[PDB]
Each structure stands twice: as C-alpha cells, then as structure tokens.
C-alpha cells in the first residue's frame, strides 16, 4: 500500500554533515508521524527519534542530541535528517518508518552513511573463468572478482538480471589497502557453456561506474 | 527508564522445531491494561518487519507459525515449525501508540540442518589483472552446512600466510547452507615465481580433507 523510498548511501569526511531524504508513495505521512533508526554495521537497531507531521515538532532520543535535526519539508511530503559534526561512530545505516495503524507499519529500504577520509574509488572487474579446475558433476562454476574499490556499495547482476539462479555475491572484504574487494559468482549447467554467454554487470554508484564483463571458458 | 534485553543473543534450532526467544523490561507494560510489546524480524540487507503487536496479536502477512504471549515484564516470540526462510534477526520493542520507542539487544537465530559437504572450484588469475601486476587467485566452497570451515593455500606446497582472505555468505533463506570465498592475492612477480597453487579445504563433511589446484600456465 504505502511505501518510503530513501536518498542513496553517502560517503563524507569527518567534520561534515550529511542530509538524507525520506519520501511517502502517499500523499503525505499519517497523524502518527514519522520515526528514525539507526543501525552501526552489525550491530542492532536503536531508536533516533521522531518528528510530528503536522506541528513539525521533532523529539530526540537522549542518546541523540546536538548533532541530529529531523525536519519536515511538507513541501512535497518529505522528511530529513540531519547530522552534523560526522564521527565514526555516525557510520551506519538510517532507516525512516511511519505507521497509521497496528496494522500500517511502512519502512525504508534505509540509507547507508559511510564516515571516512579515504578517497571514492571504482573497481576493477575480473573474470573467474570456468574450466576443469571449477567442474564438478554437470555443474560449472564462475564469476567476477571486484576488486579495489571505495566506498560501499556495489551491485551485482547477472545477464542484466537474466541469471539469478544459484548466483553467490559475497560480503566484501577491506583489504590493508583500506580498498574493498568481492567476488560473484554462479553455478551453470557445464554444457551449457557452448550454449550460453555469461556477462556480470558491475555497478558502483558512487564513483558512476558501470562495468560489463563477459566471462569466458578457459580450456587449460 | 526502561530497558529491554533479550535471551538469547544466539539461537539454533532444527529445521522444522520450534524456536522461543525471550525478552523481559526493566519494569511492567502491561499497567495500563494492555501489552506493549511489540516483535520485529529483521533479514540481511532488508529493514525491519512487524510480526506481532501488543504482545499476542499478528501482524499483517505473517503466518500462524508465528506466536507471543507474556505481560508485565516477561514476553516471548514462538515460532514453530521453523523454516529454512526464517534465519534472521528478532528484536522486542516496547512503545505505546506513540513513540518513544526501546529496542532490545536482538536475537540471531539460525536454521540447523543435516550436514552438506562444500563443493570446491579454483580458478586461476585473469590475464587482464596479471597484466596489471596483481594476482588474485580465488578460492569457491560452495553450498555447505555446517558454517564451520577451514580453507588453506598452498604455493609449491607451502602453507600461505597474511595473503589471504575469505568471507562467508548469509545462510540462504531457500535451503539453509553456506557459500564461502577465498582470495590469495600475489604480486605478478611473486606469482611468476612458483608453478603450483592449492586450496585445501577441510570440513566435518568430508571424511578427509579436499584439494583443488592448477599450475601456474597450465590454464
Ligand atoms: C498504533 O501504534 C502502532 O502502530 C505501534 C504499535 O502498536 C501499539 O503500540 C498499540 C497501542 C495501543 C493500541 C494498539 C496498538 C505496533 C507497531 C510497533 C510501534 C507501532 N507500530 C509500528
């Protein structure tokens, strides 16, 4: 029914201040207002606060005053939040919730905030060839290796979407370079690899990168 | 104020059992007559999701197989059978009508199921990032049960150390394994400098340890 669409993962220094956007599919947000929840990387959820629809009138959980402002910019149905002086510790996750009944409970999909001074970074994307050494049964395996990138995140797709089935994109790993790395891959049918093409589409918003590899055979 | 925390922090339980997880408040909801307690679910990589409200009640699209009961200052969520589709994270809140609102700690629960042995894939560095002056060789445990696993490189037959590393899938929501991966990452010169690499896996699902391996330039 009702659905919160939030503005993209952010990536600021220290310092800095970050505004992110929470938007209704409806024509505004119910008499119950709006809520605000963080969540640090796995870790758990914690209640920021909430903002009144109608008077504006925000309330902060004590664990989050001075640095956060929720506003309303009833403008066109649309709420903020708002910190300042960014720490580490602001690194996390924001999710924006409104409720018009025990029943009408609506999320966002979140707004990933990543505190850093290191610099934004596309990838390099690589091909994990299937061949004899990635073979088992009937079964062939391969992928894409992601690698040295900055911030989060990255999607990864199959065959435009195309291929989904037993695909595998693993959590990315910092390397010592303070550069993140990951790997995609999928299991095909192994004869179908006279059949079919293989390409994984790369995409790293915040550096406006998109990548097409198509993964090739490797006979050995 | 008021504080909840719940028990377990960690929960695993069979494919088809019944799982309970506990949350108690520091002080009694329930004196204004009615619960507040409210359970959430929460997936990875997903927000959180209503499952019960006021302590007993349903949330909209949830299945029977989900259940609370309590009042005052002890609660519990009651799911039975568990489903493959169920590991996730459970979190209590506490609030009114409106906020504010109290989390609790949350609980991690985890689908057991009948042990699976990973499948193993190797694969070689591409020409591309060879010619870069890098070389990743990656490493592919797929599909098993239990998480634990043990994955070691080889160089020349030579144990790896520091220049490696791996990261392990969520458990998957279809059929509750594990997919694992590992990358040993090399200078074009160092690699030029050996002929065989291995990756060694061992895991309660093989009766003895599996290798897969390639020398440098055979493929
Ligand atoms: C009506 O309030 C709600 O919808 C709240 C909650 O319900 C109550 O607190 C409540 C109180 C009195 C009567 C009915 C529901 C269910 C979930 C969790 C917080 C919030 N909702 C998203």
């Known amino acids: 029914q009702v659905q919160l669409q939030q503005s993209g993962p952010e990536l600021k220094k220290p310092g800095e201040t970050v505004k992110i956007s929470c938007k209704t599919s409806g024509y505004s947000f119910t008499n119950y207002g709006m809520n605000w929840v963080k969540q640090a990387p796995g870790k758990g959820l914690k209640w920021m606060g909430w903002?009144?629809?109608?008077?504006?009138?925000?309330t902060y959980a004590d664990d989050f005053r001075g640095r956060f402002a929720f506003s309303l910019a009833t403008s066109a149905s649309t709420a903020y939040l708002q910190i300042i002086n960014l720490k580490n510790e602001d690194t996390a996750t924001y999710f924006c919730?409104?409720?018009?009944?025990?029943?009408?409970?609506?999320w966002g999909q979140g707004t990933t905030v990543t505190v850093s001074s290191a610099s934004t970074k596309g990838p390099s994307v690589f091909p994990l060839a299937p061949s004899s050494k990635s073979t088992s049964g009937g079964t062939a395996a391969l992928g894409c290796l992601v690698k040295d990138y900055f911030p989060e995140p990255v999607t990864v797709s199959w065959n435009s979407g195309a291929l989904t089935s037993g695909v595998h994109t693993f959590p990315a790993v910092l390397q010592s370079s303070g550069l993140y790395s990951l790997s995609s891959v999928v299991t095909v049918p192994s004869s179908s690899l006279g059949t079919q093409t293989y390409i994984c589409n790369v995409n790293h918003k915040p550096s406006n990168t998109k990548v097409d590899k198509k993964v090739e055979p490797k006979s050995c | 104020d008021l504080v909840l925390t719940q028990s377990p922090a960690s929960l695993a339980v069979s494919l088809g059992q019944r799982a309970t997880i506990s949350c108690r408040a520091s002080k009694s909801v329930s004196t204004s007559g009615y619960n507040y307690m409210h359970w959430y679910q929460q997936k990875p990589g997903q927000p959180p999701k209503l499952l019960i409200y006021?302590?007993?009640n349903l949330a909209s699209g949830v299945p029977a197989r989900f259940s609370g009961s309590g009042s005052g200052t002890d609660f519990t969520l009651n799911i039975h059978p568990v489903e493959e589709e169920d590991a996730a994270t459970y979190y209590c809140?506490?609030?009114?009508?409106?906020?504010?609102?109290?989390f609790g700690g949350g609980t991690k629960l985890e689908i057991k199921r009948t042990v699976a042995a990973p499948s193993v894939f190797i694969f070689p560095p591409s020409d591309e990032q060879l010619k870069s002056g890098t070389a990743s060789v990656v490493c592919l445990l797929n599909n098993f049960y239990p998480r634990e696993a043990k994955v070691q490189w080889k160089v020349d037959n030579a144990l790896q150390s520091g220049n490696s590393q791996e990261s392990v899938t969520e458990q998957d929501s279809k059929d509750s394994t594990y997919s694992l991966s590992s990358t040993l990452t090399l200078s074009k010169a160092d690699y030029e400098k050996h002929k065989v690499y291995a990756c060694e896996v061992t895991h309660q699902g093989l009766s003895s340890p599996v290798t897969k391996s390639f020398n440098r330039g055979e493929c």
């Open positions: 809140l506490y609030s009114r009508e409106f906020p504010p609102w109290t």
């Open positions: 919730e409104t409720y018009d009944s025990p029943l009408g409970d609506y």
């Open positions: 903002i009144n629809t109608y008077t504006g009138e925000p």
């Open positions: 006021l302590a007993s």
